[PDB]
Amino acid sequence: SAVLWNQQYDKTVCNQEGEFCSKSGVDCCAGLSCRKYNLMGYGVCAAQTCSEEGTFCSLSDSDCCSGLKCKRRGHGYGECSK
C-alpha cells in the first residue's frame, strides 16, 4: 500500500491567466481571478478588468473594483480610492 507522490513541496506558487482553480481554496497569481463559468464553478484564472485602488480613473464614470470611488485629484482627473 504505497502512498502516492506529493503534488508539490516548494513554497506557494502561482500561475498566469488560464490556469484552473481547485476547491481547496487556491488563489490565482496577483491580478488574477478564477472567473466561474461551469455549473460547479470550475472556471479559470483571468486578468481583472476593474481599475485598481490609486490608479487614475474617469470621474465622470467610475471604473474601479467594488469598494473604490474615483476621487478627483488635480484638475479634472482623479484616481480610485478605498
Helices (H) and strands (E) in the chain, counts: 0, 3
**Cβ atoms 50, 65 nearer than 8 A:** yes
Residue 57 has, within 13 A of its CA and on its CB side, a CA count of 21
Q: Is 57 found in the same domain as 45?
A: no
Residue 53 corresponds to which cell in the numbers above? 485602488
Kindly state whether residue 55 falls inside one of the protein's structural domains: yes
Q: Which experiment gave this structure?
A: NMR
Kindly state whether residue 1 falls inside one of the protein's structural domains: no
Residue closest to 64 by CA, chosen among 82, 47, 77: 82
Structurally, the chain folds into a number of domains equal to: 2
Residue 47 corresponds to which cell in the numbers above? 486578468
Kindly state whether residue 9 falls inside one of the protein's structural domains: no
Q: Is 60 found in the same domain as 38?
A: no
Q: How many CB atoms lie within 10 A of CB 21?
A: 20
Kindly state whether residue 6 falls inside one of the protein's structural domains: no
Structural domain harbouring 56? 50-82
**Cβ atoms 54, 70 nearer than 8 A:** no
20 vs 28: CA distance, rounded Å:
9
68 vs 62: CA distance, rounded Å:
8
**Cβ atoms 49, 79 nearer than 8 A:** no
Kindly state whether residue 4 falls inside one of the protein's structural domains: no
Q: Is 59 found in the same domain as 34?
A: no
Amino acid at the residue 17: E
